[PDB]
Design a protein around this ligand. Structure first.
Ligand SMILES: Nc1nc2c(ncn2[C@@H]2O[C@H](COP(=O)(O)OP(=O)(O)OP(=O)(O)O)[C@@H](O)[C@H]2O)c(=O)[nH]1
Ligand SMILES: Nc1ncnc2c1ncn2[C@@H]1O[C@H](COP(=O)(O)OP(=O)(O)CP(=O)(O)O)[C@@H](O)[C@H]1O
Ligand SMILES: Nc1nc2c(ncn2[C@@H]2O[C@H](COP(=O)(O)OP(=O)(O)O)[C@@H](O)[C@H]2O)c(=O)[nH]1
Ligand SMILES: CN(c1ccc(C(N)=O)nn1)C1CCC1
Ligand SMILES: [Ca+2]
Ligand SMILES: [Ca+2]
Ligand SMILES: [Ca+2]
Ligand SMILES: [Mg+2]
Ligand SMILES: [Mg+2]
Ligand SMILES: [Mg+2]
Lengths: 352, 54, 438, 425
């Protein structure tokens, strides 16, 4: 009889895992403060890693890699990419980005204007986007004065990265979109990619002559369901899955999702996770770790994949909660606490 | 990667390697804390005996 | 030359003291009867070993130690043990009933009535020193004597020896080799009243020594003898610079200078390797780069934690055996490129390195195998704060219900000394976070 | 040298105490004459904890036999090991207590208390360093109850900083001598709450249910109930009488078991408990699963009705200490809903190489559980059933007591029930 606890009631993902665990009759749930446990579904912020792995006779497992925030925070990711030789500053799949601190507080303000003036002088597209992790608060503008003046009006760190002025547009509609891939990493650091992805598409025609209205530029699921007037017109819930998106790519462009986008995605996920393995690995640690990730990708009109950000506590698509949650119990939990396919994941082999 | 202050003797040697440059109570007060805890003991034990006398 | 007096308080300190002086004698070629064939100055001399050993006219090399326990059953093992002849009866002080794992008992009730005696016995070894450096105090955190009495002894030593240094060797409490439950109280009580009196403290977590004995020595259930023979190795390696020729860590003062920039953060993390089972057929002798690369694994730290998520303030590498500087610098370079070694911006990113050619001595019949080179890394990391967080959490759980508090109050302690000691730890944890996190 | 002073008062007290000395005497190799004839040095390691070394290598238990009628103690002296006891340590009256707490505590007992303490004092003055006392007695009778508590009240007055342990037999209407046992029990319990550090509760009903159901004894006897107490007393004292890495005296043992001064009432357990399929070897799992089973507990209290404050387990025999940890760690990690979460590591374990007589290996259970409140609920319910009508009060009011003192004992134990209740939630 294995035992676990719950410390994040707001997690729609692991709320299902706990429901499945109790359905097996072999996992008993405990109060949220009982240290005698095998598995911990911990909180998001200020998770007490230091107290894990000190209970005699208990092998403990947690669902958050300590130090993953370096990859899931806006400013941390950029600093990680420009400082990590594995990715280098010339990383071809990550938009040219810069970390900018508000003037009321290192900082890459001057380095940003340097490349900005270089672009304004060379007639090139010079539309940037400002964002941060403390947002739901994003500003798109082609003027460097408005971007910097908007960050100084706040009080937390921000990042200015190139805006993809040539995004891939679906038809019919002429609309933007992004791609969400779920990647699970077990205690052995095997990198499993969920065979099922989702595209959170915009229900508005992309307009390049008006960044003021951010409904055809932002593809978030909550902005389309609040500020968009064509929500649910083309696909149910602005969510297209890998089956239909694969058929469209074959009818219009004469190619497959595997060859055009999936290879780049599997390459980006590898490069990001292998990069920070020696920093977050729990190979010879007194406790074990495994975390679910949510990579958000972009695609331009040249079928080149760019990395937007990585989510450390992502939510899932309503249609994929069952298949994915069960998979988490198969490869991540039961692999360490066995019970008494055609895996739904894609192992991304690598050199540990 | 620099090696400074190399000292060698018969039974070994020691040096320093730099990779990157940077960027009470008196004797009177203790006897009081001890005697004070001894008084609270005597007062607690006295209340125990007074209880037994009743 | 300058002398060092060692003090062993409680069962844990006294047993670990027994295991170290056994090692010191094997290293320095000192027989159980105290004679030293290699010492050519009969009954005198200011050699390096004389920092820990004095000499008599008869040529007996006697430790500069003092064993203190409030119940005699543990010290008696020394009076009749293998090295009974080293010490004289003055150096062994024993009471008649212990502190029942009660800090308030060892500190107040029982400690007051025996403190003046220990001082006198220590004053007798001090008068034999031409230039006393300071004291090495071995004790446990859980034991009522190791915790309650040690803090009191420290307060007085800072009064009778103001300018002298005081290093600690503290045994962190681990449930796998303990039968008590109030150890978090004692640990937090003693760390509060001792903090401003200890210049540098080496914490060993029995849980760490336990798993190193189970994993590397293939002991299914290790005894205190097992734990002590390993802990005495680390201790030997840390005190070697004071007993042998050298220029690194040559006096107790150099330990604070090289390891403790901020005072309240005086708890270096220790790491040791290799630890090889003697029962093994025959092991492949590890290289300098391999054993050094092991110093950054959690599996051989005296306290289980994650230095990757802390920041280093200082770092020492004490080597023993066939090691040359050329090989050391080679391994270090390779490790900086594979590891996460984040220093604090107000401290140099460097390593002081000491090398003693004599390889580690092993007690015949012991559990460790003879290796040609070994190393011990002393690193001041904010990651050791995890050990405090663990302990401070257990303290909160019990104190929220005032559990076991009556046992301390009943021995003369005021309930306020709990919250006063706890708030001090809340300050010690904040100092670690102010220096480590961003 | 950490000596213990044993005391047994009353019929139940002395019969149980006698068998106790019969059990451990055999374990330490002490024959009925006081001569040692064992084969292991571990039998003498801690022999001075319960025995005084006389001349000629004779060992004389450090016990004091007490009672207000000569009957019971005449049996002990003529019994198997009766000669072993010190002739002077027999202190007895002739009137008797008539199963009346008042007589044992105020009138008859009072006249004899000074002479008993004179012997207690004589045994202590020889101790190099006294750990503390232990009294065996029942609470439903008059002597071991009324006088027994009176002794404790006076031993704590002369030795206010020594440990006072008691093995207390609680009355049950299924094994009842007199209808007034709830009176005597309620009065004693208040004394134990005040002047004892540890009290092992031993319900005669649980002893009866164990002999009848688990042991398959058709018609149990007081002697059968005492064999269990004998073996149990031997178990809880194993860590004290034999060597090992334990190094624990009575005070240190209480310090880790009593989180609160008044909640020092334990439930003991023993395993195995087999009926005569008696030669089967018992595995470490079986030893553990029974040790925590209520049917192996002697308080007649369902532990699953409360929560464990602290638990202590002692294992005897040549076994796999690695295997002991696993099974114990298994019981915790499989029933962690019954241990309190505000006391980390409240379950500890000890191993001993010497097993009891005639058993490859055994396990003794010591539990400080809030379930014990169900015991004091029975006693308080039976008390109120009679005191509400003042029934049988005259036996006591005639001895000099007032109804007020009864009302206080009533409210005193109801408080003890409420105290155990606020820690179960
Ligand atoms: N590493 C190691 N730890 C020990 C040793 N002896 C005891 N301990 C630990 O010390 C803690 C208990 O403290 P003790 O040293 O036994 O108590 P004490 O200092 O003698 O003080 P008293 O309570 O009066 O007995 C437990 O957590 C033990 O695990 C030892 O020889 N080696
Ligand atoms: N450099 C860039 N070029 C083009 N579009 C961008 C962009 N950066 C962000 N976006 C748009 O913003 C969205 C992602 O925003 P971002 O991830 O920064 O906020 P967020 O993290 O709160 C959303 P989530 O965490 O749910 O993925 C995408 O849908 C994308 O269309
Ligand atoms: N277990 C056990 N209980 C006993 C024994 N003798 C008496 N009792 C119980 O003790 C109570 C009577 O107390 P008693 O021994 O007569 O007290 P005394 O007057 O001091 O001798 C009743 O509840 C009995 O069930 C015995 O030998 N074994
Ligand atoms: C399990 N155990 C205990 C614990 C408590 C008591 C008691 N009589 O209170 N007895 N034995 C031993 C491990 C070292 C002590
Ligand atoms: Ca000399
Ligand atoms: Ca000082
Ligand atoms: Ca009379
Ligand atoms: Mg986000
Ligand atoms: Mg001790
Ligand atoms: Mg009777």
């Amino acid at each position: 009889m294995y035992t676990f606890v719950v410390r994040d009631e707001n997690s729609s993902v692991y709320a299902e895992v706990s429901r499945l665990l109790l359905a097996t009759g072999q996992w008993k749930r405990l109060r949220k403060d009982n240290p005698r446990f095998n598995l911990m579904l911990g909180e998001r912020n200020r998770l007490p890693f230091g107290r894990l792995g000190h209970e005699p006779g208990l092998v403990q497992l947690v669902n958050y890699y300590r130090g993953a925030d370096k990859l899931c925070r806006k400013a941390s990711l950029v600093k990680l990419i420009k400082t990590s030789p594995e990715l280098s500053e010339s990383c071809t799949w990550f938009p040219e980005s810069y970390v900018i601190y508000p003037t009321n507080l290192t900082d890459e303000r001057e380095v940003f204007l340097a490349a900005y003036n270089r672009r304004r002088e060379g007639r090139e597209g010079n539309v940037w986007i400002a964002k941060s992790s403390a947002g739901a608060g994003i500003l798109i503008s082609s003027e460097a004065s408005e971007l910097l003046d908007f960050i100084d009006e706040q009080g937390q760190v921000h990042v200015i990265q190139k805006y993809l002025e040539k995004p891939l547009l679906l038809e019919p509609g002429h609309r933007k979109f992004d791609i969400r891939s779920w990647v699970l990493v077990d205690h052995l650091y095997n990198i499993y990619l969920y065979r099922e992805g989702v595209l959170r598409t915009s229900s508005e025609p992309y307009n390049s002559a008006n960044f003021q209205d951010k409904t055809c530029h932002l593809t978030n699921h909550c902005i389309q369901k609040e500020y968009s007037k064509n929500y649910g017109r083309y696909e149910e819930g602005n969510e297209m899955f890998f089956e239909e998106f694969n058929q469209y790519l074959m009818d219009a462009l004469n190619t497959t999702l595997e060859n055009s986008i999936l290879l780049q995605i599997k390459h980006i996920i590898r490069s990001c996770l292998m990069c920070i393995e020696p920093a977050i690995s729990t190979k010879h640690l007194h406790y074990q770790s495994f975390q679910l990730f949510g990579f958000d990708f972009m695609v331009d009109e040249e079928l080149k994949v760019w990395l937007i950000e990585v989510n450390g506590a992502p939510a899932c698509a309503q249609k994929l909660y069952a298949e994915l949650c069960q998979g988490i119990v198969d490869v991540a939990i039961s692999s360490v606490f066995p019970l008494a396919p055609t895996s739904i994941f894609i192992k991304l082999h690598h050199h540990h | 990667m620099e090696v400074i202050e190399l000292n060698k003797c018969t039974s070994g040697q020691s040096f320093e390697v730099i990779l990157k440059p940077p960027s009470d109570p008196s004797l009177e007060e203790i006897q009081k804390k001890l005697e004070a805890a001894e008084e609270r003991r005597k007062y607690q034990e006295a209340e125990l005996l007074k209880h037994l006398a009743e | 030359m300058r002398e060092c007096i060692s003090i062993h308080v409680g069962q844990a300190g006294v047993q670990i003291g027994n295991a170290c002086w056994e090692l010191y004698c094997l290293e320095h070629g000192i027989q159980p009867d105290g004679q030293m064939p290699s010492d050519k100055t009969i009954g005198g001399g200011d050699d390096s070993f004389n920092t820990f050993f004095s000499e008599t006219g008869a040529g007996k090399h006697v430790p500069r130690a003092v064993f203190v326990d409030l119940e005699p059953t543990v010290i008696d093992e020394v009076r009749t043990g293998t090295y009974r002849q080293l010490f004289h009866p003055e150096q062994l002080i024993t009471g008649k009933e212990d502190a029942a794992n009660n800090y308030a008992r060892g500190h107040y009730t029982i400690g007051k009535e025996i403190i003046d005696l220990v001082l006198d016995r220590i004053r007798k070894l001090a008068d034999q020193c031409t230039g006393l450096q300071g004291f090495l105090v071995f004790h446990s955190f859980g034991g009522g004597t190791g915790s309650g009495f040690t803090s009191l002894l420290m307060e007085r030593l800072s009064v009778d020896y103001g300018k002298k240094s005081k290093l600690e060797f503290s045994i962190y409490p681990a449930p796998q080799v303990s039968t008590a439950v109030v150890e978090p109280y004692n640990s937090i009580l003693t760390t509060h009243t001792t903090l401003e009196h200890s210049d540098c403290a080496f914490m060993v977590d029995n849980e760490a020594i336990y798993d190193i004995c189970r994993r590397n020595l293939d002991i299914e259930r290790p005894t205190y003898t097992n734990l002590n023979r390993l802990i005495s190795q680390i201790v030997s390696s840390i005190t070697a610079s004071l007993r042998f020729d050298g220029a690194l860590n040559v006096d107790l003062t150099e330990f604070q200078t090289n390891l403790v920039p901020y005072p309240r953060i005086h708890f270096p993390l220790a790491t040791y390797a290799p630890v090889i089972s003697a029962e093994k057929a025959y092991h492949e002798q590890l290289s300098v780069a391999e054993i050094t690369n092991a110093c950054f694994e959690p599996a051989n730290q005296m306290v289980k934690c994650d230095p990757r998520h802390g920041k280093y303030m200082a770092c020492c590498l004490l080597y023993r055996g066939d090691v040359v500087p050329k090989d050391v610098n080679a391994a270090i370079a390779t490790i900086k490129t594979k590891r996460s070694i984040q220093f604090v911006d107000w401290c140099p990113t460097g390593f002081k390195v000491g090398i003693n050619y004599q390889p580690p001595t092993v007690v015949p019949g012991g559990d460790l195998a003879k290796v040609q080179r070994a190393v011990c890394m002393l690193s001041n990391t904010t990651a050791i704060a995890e050990a405090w967080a663990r302990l401070d959490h257990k303290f909160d759980l019990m104190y929220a219900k005032r559990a076991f508090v009556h046992w301390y109050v009943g021995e003369g302690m005021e309930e306020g000394e709990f919250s006063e000691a706890r708030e001090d730890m809340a300050a010690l944890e904040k100092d670690y976070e102010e220096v480590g996190v961003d | 040298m950490r000596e213990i002073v044993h005391i047994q008062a009353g019929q139940c007290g002395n019969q149980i105490g006698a068998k106790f000395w019969e059990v451990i005497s055999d374990e330490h190799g002490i024959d009925p004459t006081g001569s040692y004839h064992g084969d292991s040095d571990l039998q003498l390691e801690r022999i001075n904890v319960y025995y005084n070394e006389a001349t000629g290598n004779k060992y004389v238990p450090r016990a004091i036999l007490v009672d207000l009628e000569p009957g019971t103690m005449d049996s002990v002296r003529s019994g198997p090991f009766g000669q072993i006891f010190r002739p002077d340590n027999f202190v007895f009256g002739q009137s008797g207590a008539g199963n009346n707490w008042a007589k044992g505590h105020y009138t008859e007992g009072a006249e004899l208390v000074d002479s008993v303490l004179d012997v207690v004092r004589k045994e202590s003055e020889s101790c190099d360093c006294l750990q503390g006392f232990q009294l065996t007695h029942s609470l439903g009778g008059g002597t071991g109850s009324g006088m027994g508590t009176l002794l404790i009240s006076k031993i704590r007055e002369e030795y206010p900083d020594r440990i006072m342990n008691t093995f207390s037999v609680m009355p049950s209407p299924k094994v009842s001598d007199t209808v007034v046992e709830p009176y005597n029990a309620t009065l004693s319990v208040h004394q134990l709450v005040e002047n004892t550090d540890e009290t092992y509760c031993i319900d005669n009903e649980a002893l009866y249910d164990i002999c009848f159901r688990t042991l398959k004894l058709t018609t149990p006897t007081y002697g059968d109930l005492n064999h269990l107490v004998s073996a149990t007393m031997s178990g809880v004292t194993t860590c004290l009488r034999f060597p090992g890495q334990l190094n624990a005296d009575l005070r240190k043992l209480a310090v880790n078991m009593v989180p609160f001064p008044r909640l020092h009432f334990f439930m003991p357990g023993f395993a195995p408990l087999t009926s005569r399929q008696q030669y089967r070897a018992l595995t470490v799992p079986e030893l553990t699963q029974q040790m925590f089973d209520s049917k192996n507990m002697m308080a007649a209290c369902d532990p699953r009705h409360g929560r464990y404050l602290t638990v202590a387990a002692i294992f005897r025999g040549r076994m796999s200490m690695k295997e002991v940890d696993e099974q114990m760690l298994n019981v915790q990690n499989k029933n962690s809903s019954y241990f309190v979460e505000w006391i980390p590591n409240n379950v500890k374990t000890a191993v001993c190489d010497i097993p009891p007589r005639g058993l490859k290996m055994s396990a003794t259970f010591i539990g400080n559980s809030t379930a014990i409140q169900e015991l004091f609920k029975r006693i308080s319910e039976q008390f109120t059933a009679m005191f509400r009508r003042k029934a049988f009060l005259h036996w006591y009011t005639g001895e000099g007591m007032d109804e007020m003192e009864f009302t206080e004992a009533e409210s005193n134990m109801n408080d003890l029930v409420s105290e155990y209740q606020q820690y179960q939630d």
